[PDB]
Paper text:
L-aspartate aminotransferase (AST, EC 2.6.1.1) is not only a key metabolic enzyme that links amino acid metabolism to carbohydrate metabolism through reversible transamination reaction but also an enzyme that regulates the cellular level of amino acid by catalyzing amino acid degradation and biosynthesis. AST generally forms a homodimer consisting of two active sites in the vicinity of subunit interfaces; these active sites bind to its cofactor PLP and substrate independently. Each subunit is composed of three parts: large domain, small domain, and N-terminal arm. The active site is situated in the cavity formed by two large domains and one small domain.
In this study, to suggest a broader view of the three-dimensional structure and show the structural features of PLP-family proteins, we determined the crystal structure of AST from Schizosaccharomyces pombe. The structure of SpAST forms a very stable homodimer with an unusually extended interface. Each subunit of SpAST folds up into three spatially and functionally distinct regions: a large domain, a small domain, and the N-terminal arm. Two tyrosine residues in both of the large domains, Tyr298 in helix α11, forms a face-to-face pi interaction with each other within a distance of 4 Å, contributing to stable dimerization of the dimer. Unexpectedly, two additional electron densities were found at the active site and the surface that could be fitted to phosphate and glycerol molecules. A clear density that could be fitted in most likely a phosphate was found in the active site of SpAST. Interestingly, the phosphate was located in the corresponding position of the phosphate moiety of PLP. The phosphate moiety interacts with the main chain of Gly108 and Thr109 and the side chain of Arg263 and Tyr70. Notably, the electron densities of Arg289 and Lys255 in SpAST were somewhat poor, but unambiguously, the positions of Arg289 and Lys255 side chains were located away from the cofactor or inhibitor from SpAST. This was presumably owing to the absence of its substrate or inhibitor.
Numbering used by the authors:
A (entry chain A): 2 to 410
B (entry chain B): 2 to 409
The structure:
């Protein structure tokens, strides 16, 4: 202001933040927030996983417990265990010392690490662009653009068929310049919820390799999506068979409910230990000059679970609890729309997976739901299934039924 | 590697890391780690502050405790109280809604936030360089250079007088281009430990004001340094009188022992609420595109202490415990060097404050201390007092005495 800062333009309101403001001002007792991006139980409350609560109690009583700095790359028994749970069918990647793992400030910080590294050591001399799904998590675009990488998209949501636009994605893969960067969702695509089949994945991998593209997997919902850890990491482990180095950005925010503790890991899967160590040393330079070292509390908890056979088994029970409740809400919503004979097909509701769903509603229909049924969710029709429970799912189905019947497109 | 990554050259190890590796390989029973980057108690061990142990139990036993996402700018009860403890003499800054406060990944993350914002909204319009003390924490230079700002230095360590180079710093402030960026240490200068006196600060501020420089304060040791929170933030609050907007990067790593939980805050002290809100909205964009939101555990602990009068009083006792122990070690070391009649003057050991000290030892004397007395510290003579205690301080004094006498 003695320095020109009053000339700055104040930034536009965050998308999620402005919806939340409107939800909170609504005075109707039947209102529902269907934009919450975190798991909720059947009463609509945050839910601490019993295994996580148990692990944090165990950790706090340990004689060695303290608040001292971690190594720059993070807590070693966390980074090692985080890689192991991704690659249970491929333990040789760890034992051959081929995975460079950096504990990160959750999934977003892992993406920031990978993108910073890839921009400096790949984009600089190749001019490659990064390709993200259309639609995707909106930070995927701005995070990469802020680091100076040009962002392109590949088609993903086929709105007419309410399904995955396999042919559009494949066509973009084949026509993109060789050696482009492709940001892939490992499972439970955000925001649509619809994943490629295994058959579609194999064809996707074939074309990615034929064009020599560089692959970055984002895996934010392993185990949380299906309750089965190896099923949810299937695409990652299938890609290992092709013997191309690649990157993985991993979050424990949802599958351990650690959200605000910021527990994640970035991995580079090298072809040999020598390159693993070259890359790791450069990743440490980025880490040193952004955060210095990562937060310990969530990592200690995750390492405790992952390295204990009994806590691991109890965590898998908690994953089953969460994934089953979402599946049950998807079934309830779809079953009510079928019973109400709502125009259109509604099987995409149960063919999708994870806590986000592209419903297929239009902006007019979403606005109708907001004004007449006090449902708050995104204009593109994305809902969070976590907001749905036994007390409101019939109200939600009735709203959708009315909106679609009243406002056909 | 199918992508050219085998052509990357492996970065060389950090000097501190390589030093610690050498310390732990040394089998000599009298070895001392003089490079510990964190507080240690009188027995050489990590030390959880009693108030922090109490605060964390209170936090986790609270009925509403959970692990949910914080807002982009962090836990409001933390960021408000983090500003309050900096500006206790100046409560009008908060009541007029003039402080934009962003919870960060400790002091490093606060610095990254401040530097990213200043590069984007100040440096690219003015061409300003940032001036850091010579010496300073080495990440200050690389953090700013990585973001595209040219880094200059101002003189700080007077090696011949073993003191603060006031005239050199003042001369650089006066000759730097108008509108330059100056990174200042609020108290307990890292790595020398020597601070400007209050009268030197007043003259420093006048010259900064007359050249219209932009000021960024780093405050990583408030309360930890002297045991007195308001004394340690005196320079911050004195600068408030000059009515220029400015930045503060705050860390709770040392003063709450929260090191690995990564608890800190960046503040922009605006002239008015309008610009405060403009800057804050741009800070949130940077934060959204790097970490999304900051880690909750340490911030909840800090907010519990800072918002409770009784816990705050307990924490102030822990601050007295830590600062007193470091002062006593400095006194023990200084008094032994005086009694050993070690050539040179050693009052700088007790005129410095905080955990880090420039000893004045030469590289050959430091190397002598490592090989003959198994003391591990930096070749510029910087030591950490945290590793000193009753079991080894006399060994350290005798090493310095021998090193200085043998290598004049």
């Amino acid at each position: 202001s003695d320095y020109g800062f009053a000339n700055i333009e104040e930034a536009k309101a965050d998308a999620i933040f402005k919806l939340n403001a409107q939800y909170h001002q609504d005075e109707d007792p039947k209102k529902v927030n269907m934009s919450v991006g975190a798991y909720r139980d059947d009463t609509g409350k945050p839910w601490i996983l019993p295994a996580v609560k148990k692990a944090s109690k165990i950790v706090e009583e340990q004689a060695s417990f303290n608040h001292e700095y971690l190594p720059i790359a993070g807590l070693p028994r966390f980074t090692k265990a985080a890689a192991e749970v991704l690659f249970r069918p491929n333990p040789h990647l760890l034992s051959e010392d081929r995975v460079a793992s950096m504990q990160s400030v959750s999934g977003t910080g892992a993406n920031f690490l990978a993108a910073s590294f890839i921009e400096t050591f790949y984009v600089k001399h190749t001019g490659a662009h990064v390709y993200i799904s259309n639609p995707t998590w909106p930070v995927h675009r701005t995070l990469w653009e802020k680091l100076g990488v040009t962002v392109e998209t590949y088609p993903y949501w086929d709105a007419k068929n309410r399904s995955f636009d396999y042919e559009g994605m494949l066509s973009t893969i084949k026509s993109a310049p060789e050696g482009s960067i492709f940001l892939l969702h490992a499972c439970a695509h955000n925001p649509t919820g619809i994943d490629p089949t295994r058959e579609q994945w194999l064809s996707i991998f074939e074309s990615l390799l034929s064009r020599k593209h560089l692959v970055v997997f984002d895996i934010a919902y392993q185990g949380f999506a299906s309750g089965d850890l190896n099923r949810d990491s299937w695409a990652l482990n299938e890609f290992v068979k092709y013997n191309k180095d690649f990157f993985v950005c991993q979050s424990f925010a949802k599958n351990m409910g650690l959200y605000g503790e910021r527990t994640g890991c970035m991995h580079y899967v090298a072809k040999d230990a020598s390159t693993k160590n070259k890359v790791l040393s450069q990743l440490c330079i980025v880490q040193r000059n952004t955060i210095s070292n990562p937060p310990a509390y969530g990592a200690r908890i995750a390492a405790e679970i992952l390295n204990s056979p009994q806590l691991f088994a109890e965590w898998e029970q908690d994953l089953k609890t969460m994934s089953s409740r979402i599946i049950e809400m998807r079934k309830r919503l779809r079953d009510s729309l079928v019973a109400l004979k709502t125009p259109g097909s509604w099987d995409h509701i149960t063919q999708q997976i994870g806590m986000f769903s592209f419903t297929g509603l239009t902006p007019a229909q979403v606005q109708f739901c907001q004004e007449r049924y006090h449902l708050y969710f995104s204009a593109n029709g994305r809902i969070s299934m976590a907001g749905l429970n036994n007390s409101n799912v019939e109200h939600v189905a009735q709203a959708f039924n009315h909106a679609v019947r009243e406002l056909p497109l």
